[PDB]
Scaffold this active site. Sequence first.
Site, PDB file in Angstrom:
ATOM      1  N   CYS A 276      27.840  45.389 -23.033  1.00  0.00           N
ATOM      2  CA  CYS A 276      28.287  45.740 -24.376  1.00  0.00           C
ATOM      3  C   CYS A 276      27.119  45.782 -25.344  1.00  0.00           C
ATOM      4  CB  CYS A 276      29.343  44.748 -24.876  1.00  0.00           C
ATOM      5  SG  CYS A 276      30.961  44.856 -24.032  1.00  0.00           S
TER       6      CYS A 276
ATOM      7  N   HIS B 124      31.025  45.192 -30.308  1.00  0.00           N
ATOM      8  CA  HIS B 124      31.862  44.095 -30.809  1.00  0.00           C
ATOM      9  C   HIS B 124      31.049  42.969 -31.443  1.00  0.00           C
ATOM     10  CE1 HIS B 124      30.844  41.086 -27.749  1.00  0.00           C
ATOM     11  NE2 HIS B 124      30.777  42.100 -26.905  1.00  0.00           N
TER      12      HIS B 124
END
Length: 352
Positions: free
Chosen positions: A299, A281
């Site tokens: 992440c 992201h």
Amino acid sequence: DLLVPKLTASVTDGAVGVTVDAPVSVTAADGVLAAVTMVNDNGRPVAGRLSPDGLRWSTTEQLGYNRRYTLNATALGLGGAATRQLTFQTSSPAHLTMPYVMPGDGEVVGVGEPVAIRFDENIADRGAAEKAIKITTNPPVEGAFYWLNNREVRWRPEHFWKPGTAVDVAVNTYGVDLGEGMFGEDNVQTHFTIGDEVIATADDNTKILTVRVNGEVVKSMPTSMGKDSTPTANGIYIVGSRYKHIIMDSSTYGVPVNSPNGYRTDVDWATQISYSGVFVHSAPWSVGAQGHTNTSHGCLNVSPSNAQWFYDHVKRGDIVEVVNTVGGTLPGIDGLGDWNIPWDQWRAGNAK
Ligand SMILES: *C(=O)CC(=O)[C@@H](C)CC(=O)C(=O)O
């Protein structure tokens, strides 16, 4: 010596537990079928079809669970006539389970995309479920079933799909005893195609996320993965859903927000690659660290533009590989970690 017509059915009179996974048929010998009717208990007729030569009659619509059917047939020949009356009862399930099959029909997906059949109930007889699932590939390739949990089974080849391969998934569970009186509520049938080979590798040594399309490097993204205490696991991730924006809630993945490792973050251009909550992201706040230092909860943090690029160019089923981090390996039964299970162990399956 002229012969009397003979009537043969694919059921017998007095039969019970007749499974409704198959049509019911009647055949004539030494004569032709002059009349065939099948009614349910309530007297409602069942749709059927007689073959042109008059020799074969079969039902043509779905037969219901928990029913008493009555079959009447009459055959005429030069030898005379013959009539039979058969009554039988179909399966009477204690429970019904509905199957759900991913990926979606008509979809085009990446080379790491497994076939997924999820039931809404625990499957007592996995072997009966596997048998009831007919998978067709083109070009043909070997694959095997493996269960991630009591409700979802996966099918995949030993290696990543060959691009251009058609996959046909026929979940023919209606009328099937899946164990302990649980039968399939219905059938499902999905078909999908394998698109381009998209493989993105995140190397902790270089802090770069390299995207390769059919062997070719097309994008190199500086990234910041999980900081030492919450490292990004090594291994093979299957790309799942993608989002223009999403609120990432650690409680969704078992970790309380108010925890030392908790978090609730609204992010842009999020591509999920593990059920455990790993996303590629947009991380603007860490653009300085990306390519140098890991700072995330797990992440793969990249620039806003690279995140949107990833969103636009990577699809469901494409592959992300993480290497050389201080983490362990992604669990094979993550939901998107199927490839981390060795082929011999996957092929051996776990139907019990
Ligand atoms: C995904 O699991 C969450 C993350 O690892 C990123 C959002 C990075 C992060 O939490 C941060 O503190 O920057």
